[PDB]
């Protein structure tokens, strides 16, 4: 079970773990919004080769995933699960957490994302050759930005994205179920305390995050089929472990 004192302690524990494992502080991302890529710089990105742009994005995604891994390890109860279920939860949830965290680096006023020191629109990634996926991710960040998430709200929501008792392959499903339920109580208690329960109906549907990750794996296999040696020789090992089954 859990009393009111224990639920509130869980809230603060989750928010602290998130603060300690956020890649960049929100204030750092906000104070850079005027720093936008020039038209010549955007053109420079569009002329880079497809495989060089793919490995740069793979590198940035891998760095972000590593902070999500540390977030999970600080999450109360996660290290208490068996390592099989720890890996199952991270394999299916790490990318999903990064997609939610991305909205902190997204400026809804001009539809730009902070990328390699400056803000750029989705045309910055045109060399990737997956404009539908990029557009879907930018649209997802746009829908999240309309909610005006606080850092505490992102902390508790991404914990629930990670701790999902429905992931296929879990061996101790009931143990994850109790941890997910405690985090749901903490999330909803914090929304009730802060009069923010109206955002519950506006959160993205369940299949939305899994649809984006499926698109990502789908586009990766298209690129890997065109440049298999590039992936083997120049992609990060953690990236290939999560997304190309290695």
């Amino acid at each position: 079970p859990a009393s009111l004192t224990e639920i509130e302690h869980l809230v603060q524990s989750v928010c602290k773990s998130y603060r300690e494992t956020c890649q960049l502080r929100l204030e750092d991302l906000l104070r850079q919004r005027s720093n936008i890529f020039s038209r010549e710089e955007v053109t420079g990105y569009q002329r880079k080769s497809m495989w060089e742009m793919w490995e740069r994005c793979a590198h940035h995604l891998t760095e972000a995933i590593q902070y999500v891994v540390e977030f999970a390890k600080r999450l109360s109860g996660f290290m208490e699960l068996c390592q099989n279920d720890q890996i199952v939860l991270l394999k299916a949830g790490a990318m999903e957490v990064v997609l939610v965290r991305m909205c902190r680096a997204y400026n809804a006023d001009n539809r730009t994302v902070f990328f390699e020191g400056k803000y750029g629109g989705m045309e910055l990634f045109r060399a990737l050759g997956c404009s539908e996926l990029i557009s879907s991710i930018f649209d997802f960040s746009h829908s999240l930005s309309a909610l005006h998430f606080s850092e505490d709200e992102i902390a508790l929501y991404t914990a629930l994205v990670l701790i999902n008792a429905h992931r296929p392959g879990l061996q101790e499903k009931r143990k994850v179920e109790q941890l997910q339920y405690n985090l749901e109580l903490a999330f909803h208690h914090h929304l009730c305390k802060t009069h923010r329960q109206s955002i519950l109906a506006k959160l993205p549907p369940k299949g939305k995050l899994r649809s984006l990750c499926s698109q990502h794996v789908e586009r990766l296999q298209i690129f890997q089929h065109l440049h298999p040696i590039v992936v083997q020789a120049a992609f990060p090992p953690l990236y290939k472990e999560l997304f190309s089954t290695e």
């Binding site: 590593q66 891994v69 390890k73 394999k91 953690l238 472990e241 999560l242």
Partner: peptide
């Protein structure tokens, strides 16, 4: 594999 080492 990498995830195993990061969790240790």
């Amino acid at each position: 594999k990498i995830l195993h080492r990061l969790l240790q």
